[PDB]
Ligand SMILES: N[C@H]1C(C(=O)O)=CC=C[C@@H]1O
């Protein structure tokens with residue numbers, strides 16, 4: 193029987209942010225069973241904590257309702273906050289299929305409030321399917337070039353000219369299903385403060401509340417297209433329209449041709465805790 | 471303030487099959503606006519909230535999808551009955567809802583509730599009258615029977631498919647279906663005592679539901695009305711296969727079209743997990 197905790201990632205009060213279910217002592221579970229348990233929980237992702245194989249503190253497998261991912265931001269954030277309660281450490285190294293991800297935990301009197309990660313440095317290229325994507329989304333143009341970024345999963349970015357225009361999107365989900373192994377991230381804002389919405393049939397979600405692996409790439413995207421400075425911290429607020437406001441903090445250091453660090457951080461809180469029968 | 475919950479997989483005998491529901495105990499201190507938010511947090515087709523009774527039943531149950539409250543629903547109440555069945559020795563349970571009190575008969579094996587049967591509200595029905603629009607949204611050109619909508623709290627439309635292969639081949643346009651408010655679209659195929667279903671409902675916050683217990687009773691009526699079975703004949707409705715959540719519902723509608731005397735729906739259920747929440 194496995195214990196789990198529900199963490200609300202990128203939130204400072206339960207019922208805000210993006211839930212993840214974090215399953216402990218999962219070494220006895222076959223990957224097909226992990227996928228079934230993820231399907232059962234029906235959250236954007238469930239994670240499984242396994243003994244480390246390469247010098248980290250643990251190995252984390254990450255599942256959507258429909259597939260496994262090699263890296264993801266919100267689920268690893270919540271996993272790191274949940275696992276922080278197990279030890280006194282303020283540095284935590286979590287293994288994933290993209291490599292070992294370093295975390296710094298914000299603790300008060302030993303109690304975990306928040307965490308910060310160094311993400312894999314993404315690569316990118318032009319999407320090459322603009323007219324198809326924009327038709328699906330129900331709009332005419334992107335404010336900036338439409339590019340697709342890879343850090344494990346893939347994330348496409350489409351810019352909107354106002355927050356009201358972002359909120360008014362009603363995408364064709366069936367048409368977005370033609371975009372395999374990627375999530376579609378639509379953004380609007382100014383300066384240090386940005387809003388986002390994410391849609392991904394490929395990753396089993398109509399609309400996601402907090403796409404943490406997209407936050408670091410967005411910071412890169414905004415700097416490459418001259419809207420912010422490299423090294424400038426940004427706030428990205430996602431999930432407002434669906435009633436799940438989630439605050440992600442991101443900073444990309446270096447320059448377009450040579451990035452040195454892609455940091456994403458947030459608060460997280462425990463919503464609940466329990467046990468499953470298998 | 472803290473609340474205990476159980477996850478019941480309804481219309482299944484083993485975990486990871488059927489349709490999950492989260493059942494929250496001693497929920498009187500939660501305002502409906504907070505219940506709605508908890509249901510979204512769980513993200514299951516429904517969560518239910520167990521309140522003290524007001525009209526001589528055992529409990530009053532409020533039922534929420536991820537986006538709205540419903541006055542009655544089958545799967546969530548089956549799971550609620552099985553969960554509450556662990557706390558009692560009684561053979562029957564009476565659950566108050568916005569639709570009235572729903573009677574359940576509990577089935578035990580060893581010391582343990584493994585299944586239950588409910589008497590549902592008797593539905594009303596009519597044609598939907600929007601065949602062209604609905605069929606377009608579904609991606610097909612007609613239905614094998616008249617397209618009709620039944621009301622037992624929620625509303626359920628039925629669209630018939632000529633084969634199970636044709637049913638599994640549906641790839642509906644969720645956005646176009648969102649123009650159908652306050653209803654679920656139930657697509658069916660099969661023969662005799664054996665039927666397959668798929669349900670789609672942007673109105674009730676689900677792309678595709680695994681087991682729509684409030685649709686099982688009405689489908690039995692619809693099949694009888696349209697001469698595919700006899701009134702009083704029990705049927706087996708298998709839902710959720712294409713999404714990896716196979717769920718078996720048993721239904722019987724007794725009487726005649728002009729006067730239904732009982733609409734019974736039953737099924738197995740099993741506990742998948744339990745826990746506590748911080749509000
Ligand atoms: N939570 C999202 C995610 C993330 O990085 O948080 C990656 C891919 C899809 C999930 O819905």
Ligand SMILES: N[C@H]1C(C(=O)O)=CC=C[C@@H]1O
Nearest residue numbers: 543544545679682683684
């Ligand atoms: N499980 C379904 C339900 C039911 O009766 O089980 C009614 C309406 C929509 C839900 O997804």
